[PDB]
Amino acid sequence: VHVNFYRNYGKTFKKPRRPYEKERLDAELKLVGEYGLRCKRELWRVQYALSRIRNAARHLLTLDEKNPRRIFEGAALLRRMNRYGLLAEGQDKLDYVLALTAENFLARRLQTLVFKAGMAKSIHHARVLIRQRHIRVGRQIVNVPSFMVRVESEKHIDFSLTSPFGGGPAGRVKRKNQKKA
Amino acid sequence: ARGLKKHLKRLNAPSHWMLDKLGGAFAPKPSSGPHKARECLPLILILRNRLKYALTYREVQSILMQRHIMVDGKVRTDKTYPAGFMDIISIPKTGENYRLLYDTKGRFRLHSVRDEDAKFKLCKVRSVQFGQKGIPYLNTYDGRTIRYPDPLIKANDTIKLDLETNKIVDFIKFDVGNVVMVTGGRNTGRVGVIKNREKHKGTFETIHVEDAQGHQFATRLGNVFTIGKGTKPWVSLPKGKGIKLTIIEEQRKRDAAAQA
Amino acid sequence: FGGGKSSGFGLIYDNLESAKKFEPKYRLIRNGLATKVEKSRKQIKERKNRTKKIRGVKKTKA
Amino acid sequence: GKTRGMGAGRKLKTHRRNQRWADKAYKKSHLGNEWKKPFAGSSHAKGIVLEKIGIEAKQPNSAIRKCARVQLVKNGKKIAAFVPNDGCLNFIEENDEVLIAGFGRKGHAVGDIPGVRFKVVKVSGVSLLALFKEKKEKPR
Amino acid sequence: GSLARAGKVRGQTPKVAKQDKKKQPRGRAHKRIQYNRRFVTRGPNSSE
Amino acid sequence: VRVSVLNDALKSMYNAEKRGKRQVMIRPSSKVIIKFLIVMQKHGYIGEFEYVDDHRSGKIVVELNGRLNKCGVISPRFDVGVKEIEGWTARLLPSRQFGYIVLTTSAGIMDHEEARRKNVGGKVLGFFY
RNA sequence: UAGGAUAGGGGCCUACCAUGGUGGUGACGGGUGACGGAGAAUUAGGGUUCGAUUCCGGAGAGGGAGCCUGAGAAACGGCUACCACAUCCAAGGAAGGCAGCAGGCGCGCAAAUUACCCAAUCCUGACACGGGGAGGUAGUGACAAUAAAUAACAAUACCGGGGUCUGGUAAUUGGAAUGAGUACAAUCUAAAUCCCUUAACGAGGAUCCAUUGGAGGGCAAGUCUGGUGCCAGCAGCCGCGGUAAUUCCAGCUCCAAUAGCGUAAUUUAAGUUGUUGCAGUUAAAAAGCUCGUAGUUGGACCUUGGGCCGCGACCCCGUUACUUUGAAGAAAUUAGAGUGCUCAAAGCAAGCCAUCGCUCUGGAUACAUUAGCAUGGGAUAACAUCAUAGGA
Ligand SMILES: [K+]
Ligand SMILES: [K+]
Ligand SMILES: [K+]
Ligand SMILES: [K+]
Ligand SMILES: [K+]
Ligand SMILES: [K+]
Ligand SMILES: [Mg+2]
Ligand SMILES: [Mg+2]
Ligand SMILES: [Mg+2]
Ligand SMILES: [Mg+2]
Ligand SMILES: [Mg+2]
Ligand SMILES: [Mg+2]
Ligand SMILES: [Mg+2]
Ligand SMILES: [Mg+2]
Ligand SMILES: [Mg+2]
Ligand SMILES: [Mg+2]
Ligand SMILES: [Mg+2]
Ligand SMILES: [Mg+2]
Ligand SMILES: [Mg+2]
Ligand SMILES: [Mg+2]
Ligand SMILES: [Mg+2]
Ligand SMILES: [Mg+2]
Ligand SMILES: [Mg+2]
Ligand SMILES: [Mg+2]
To answer: Looking at chain C, which subunits does it touch, using at least 3 CB pairs closer than 8 Å as the criterion?
Structure first.
């Protein structure tokens, strides 16, 4: 026996049943361009996560409002949706969880929030800035653009202290240029 | 197989040990002893996983070979010694004494006890019958044989045993209205008073227990352990006081603690 | 990740004899309190088998 | 009508068991005749090129499909394997190792080629696609 | 049948070398180009 | 032969309601049909009904109010636990807002919502909506 | 029935006796490319298919058989013999069992190093110490899975659109940014190595150059150019190719997915197996007709009302199905609570202004057919009775 065999893993996305439908291709490309995604799989995994959350919410809506599992798991689901900024305060019911779209999840990415915070000129500039290790959430630098930012962590998105845009020293391009000068 | 198994695969270990899935291929197989393998907490687990005194298997060996650990007043050097319910674990160097009780989630918890309270354990009488020479003798579920027991003591009774003198100093008759702790099943660690005993000829006997807050639960006779005469247990209980909480109330407690 | 801070574990023994008794050998070798004996496990195994083939005090000369 | 009684579970189960044999897919799977096929239930098989042959297409089409006659090694069964990719018959020689595969319709003949359900995929250890695209060369 | 004509057309076809062109951006940038072309700007390959 | 008198009663009522009839006669009568009709009347899907005693299996004359879309039996009377009521309602009811499944339970003959309210399972008699 | 034997029940065996036992509710036999289960894939629900493999149970150590020792073996890294292979020999003999680890032939469509180590987990011995191809570490490894580069910005010029404003384009022009890589070092580690961290170095055609399939329809994308001319070839299917080929061979361009994609059993699609849920006048399909056993299915009828207190209660030694509740139904897997491994797939951790410590830190919960046990219910239904009640 190898102990490593017991580590779990799973798939994060599915491919569409119809590969070449014009309407779906246009909608996916519109979302990808709006949020600077690297491929369709990044949107497909968000759709996969939304599908699992929606299935959970629907299954508790098909149970009584006194069923102790619906009180408990619906409270947990609402806490998770409020924690990541996916739901407002007035939207405090399991019904509103069913109304969530992949747009709501894509709007909470570190790339989208870095772009909307003014730190980057474009969504693609935000993507490169995050992948260049210039962005920290709290004290932790995050080089992963699909990072889902909590509302309590939104106000702590900032330039890295080791980055030239965050008080750090100049990068190798600038330093080499001044050394040439 | 052609004989006894010497190894316990880690996946096949008791779930109340809370052993992690990727810590290795193996779990400590409990040695034979006073308690059953599936219902005990081995000494190595207590020393390394629970008390954090040792960090490795070898460190547990080093601690135990120093003769630092006494189980129910006696020095044990076996790491897989099957310490079980109500056992006294004493370390007479740091001056700390532990009674192995169950929390309401079915997991053994080392409960700190006073020096005087570590001088006795509670044992459950398994059977009373005549031994050789016609001498009456008592046996318990923790493997002890006591000769010349009080004739008023019957099977399923709880006796109070003084570890220093090794005699029955007091006992409790298994009656309706005595506070009990469930030691097996899904209600393990729950504390309540017996309301009635439903007997069925030829099969297991069902005990109906109601806790202090009013919740009612039922369990077999083999999973009931009397801990006090009346509504006052003879030992101290862990923080939960044997009152199981639903996950909603646990979430309420967590929310209140986070808010504070 | 991202640098700036590190985490590890530390032990401080009350005296050097406690450490030489309770500490694993490789950590003492790391701290210079012991010497690494260079051995090949496979060579030990082969020598053990060859010597198990022999009986008596002539085992050492084989 | 069909039986509906609460006590008629056996009738329903036995009827379904007997009627499943009418389905072609079920009977193909559970008859055991697929073990008598040339491939004997395997996706691919290796074989010896016995001789290069050209077999005419169906009536509407007019072409020589230029297949290969292959003797399998696992069971010694002779089959006809199509050689795709214009010009790839010249990569095929007698007494040469070839990896055959299915022609994609599960033993059913494909396209205008009559009686052929096998294609050559690899020759002398080199894929036919690589030889067509000149990514690799056939060993001497 | 006759196997002599195997490879006829592909051998007859004159060899035309591929133009050495600029590479297109690869990954997120390629999706950016496609998004711009079909959302901020006849089929895609119309012979106009 | 007559195998299920409830089926004949419900099918005759359904046909009469589709035909626009304001009265339907049920023969034979039975306690299960009167108990199904009481549930139907309680939910407002039928009006007055009258048991006619003929010193035999009786007759029922039911007033129809045009509020019936369909009523039918489920045969066999499958065992339905409280937990399978959701699956049965999804199978048979037009929506989760309207419609009733009639169950025979040891607590009595009742609609599925009332069965949920007392947490009693049983067997399915039929449905109406 | 009586013995014998065994650790012990038992036709397990023996002696005698009787004629039983199973079977369309499928015995017996045959097939299985059949070890069983936990489970796995796909699943609206129902379902279909798989389950050699790390957890549990069983079985075997070339095939049989028989044993010794021992608490425990019908043991095979123990013995004895036969069968089949097969090794050394001085020909007199002697020694065998990789379905352990690695590795090698062979077989094949099909699968890695004759590495290091007991540091972890744990086991074992006279034992704190030895040993462990259990197990771990590294190597090979596009099985499978997770995250994620291959550029970003600005100015000129163009095209614009909404002169101005704002958008997209250029191997244009500029400075910024950075990791792939290299490498001090530290860290890692049993020792190494990888990762994480980090000096110095490391981008312009940022050649630090992304591919795999396609472009008639299904089905996203060309009725562009050259060649071939029913040939060569393509084509899953329908079809294309005979001189103007949107389909072959190529170039250009475009399309899909993208560090991946193409090709060759099973699920879905399939309400084309249908219990939910298909059909049977003419499309495939009502036996020529009737009787008839088993099976399946079987009319109605029997304690209801009522009020009171107060949703419970009150008042005026036949079974079973079914349902309800409880206890069980290993873990892992699944669902799911908590938790910022930087995210994630994961894991079962952790968190706390920094604490010689603390939070009793956490390490939930749900599900789990059928069969078994127990509790309440008796509407529905099954079986058994059901005018010598000859009742008490
Ligand atoms: K055994
Ligand atoms: K016996
Ligand atoms: K006998
Ligand atoms: K022994
Ligand atoms: K070890
Ligand atoms: K040891
Ligand atoms: Mg006998
Ligand atoms: Mg087999
Ligand atoms: Mg298996
Ligand atoms: Mg096999
Ligand atoms: Mg294997
Ligand atoms: Mg096994
Ligand atoms: Mg064996
Ligand atoms: Mg073999
Ligand atoms: Mg043997
Ligand atoms: Mg061996
Ligand atoms: Mg062995
Ligand atoms: Mg590249
Ligand atoms: Mg099209
Ligand atoms: Mg072309
Ligand atoms: Mg049909
Ligand atoms: Mg006809
Ligand atoms: Mg016909
Ligand atoms: Mg009836």
So the answer is: A, B
Decide: helix, strand or coil at residue F13.
helix
Provide the 10 A C-beta neighbour count for residue A45.
Answer: 17
* Nearest 10 degrees: Cα torsion A28, A33, A37, A38: 90
DSSP-derived secondary structure letter, B39:
G
DSSP structure class, residue A128 = H
Tell me if residue F122 falls in helix, strand or coil.
strand
Residue type, D128: L
Q: What is the C-alpha separation between D1 and C43, in angstroms, rounded? A: 82
Q: Which amino acid is at E24?
A: Q
Distance set, CA D94 to CA B88, B168, D56, D123, E4 (Å): 85, 96, 21, 11, 16
**For chain E, how far is it from start to end, CA to CA, in angstroms?**
45
User: What tokens were used for D95?
Assistant: 């007494």
- The order of strands in the sheet holding F59-63 is F23-26, F59-63, F49-52
Cβ atoms of B222 and B204 closer than 8 Å: yes
Structure tokens that stand for B183 in this block? 């030691």
Give the Cα separation of D9 and D25 in Å (integer).
25
**In chain D, residues 1 through 20 whose Cβ sits under 7 angstroms from any atom of nucleic acid strand G:** 1-8, 10-12, 16, 19-20
| Residue F111 near residue F101 (C-beta atoms within 8 A) | yes
b/e per residue F10-28 (b: at least 16 CB within 10 A): bebbbebbeeeeeebebbe
B215-B220-B222-B226 Cα dihedral, nearest 10 degrees: 30
A102-105 long-range contacts, CB within 8 A, separation 24+: A102/A31, A102/A43, A102/A46, A102/A47, A102/A50, A103/A31, A105/A46, A105/A49, A105/A50, A105/A148
Query: Hunting for tokens 């006659």 — which residue is that?
Result: D69
What's the CA gap between D133 and D87, in Å, rounded? 11
Q: How far apart are CA B80 and CA B61, in angstroms?
A: 10
Residue E10, chain D, CB below 8 Å: the answer is yes
CA angle (D76, D79, D81) in 5-degree steps = 130
The chains in contact with chain E, meaning 3 or more Cβ pairs closer than 8 Å, are A, D
Residue C18, token pair as written in the block? 């406690």
Alpha-helix runs per DSSP H in chain A? 22-35, 40-61, 68-83, 94-98, 102-106, 110-116, 123-131, 151-154, 172-180
Q: How far is CA B16 from CA A123, B40, B45, E35, E42, in A?
A: 50, 9, 11, 56, 69
Q: Is the CB of B28 under 7 A from strand G?
A: yes
Nearest residue to A96 (alpha-carbon basis) of A51, A149, A58, A44:
A58
Of F61, F84, F78, F48, the closest CA to residue F12 belongs to F61
B96 near B89, Cβ under 8 Å?
no
- Best residue in A20, A39, A146 to probe E by mutation, most E CBs within 10 Å? A39
How would you classify the pairing of strands B145-147 and B179-182? unpaired
Q: What are phi and psi of F26, to 5 degrees?
A: -115, 125
Of the CA atoms within 13 Å of residue C38, those in its CB half-sphere come to 0
Contact B19, B164 (CB under 8 A): no
Nearest Cα residue to B140 out of B86, B66, B99: B86
Q: Which residues contact B156 (CB under 8 A, 6 or more apart)?
A: B124, B125, B174, B221, B224
DSSP one-letter code for E25? P
**Chain C residues close to B58, C-beta within 8 Å:** 24
Selection from A47, A53, A37, A45 nearest residue A145 by Cα: A37
* Chain E CB contacts of D87 below 8 Å: 6-7, 10-11
CA angle C33, C36, C41 (to 5 degrees): 150
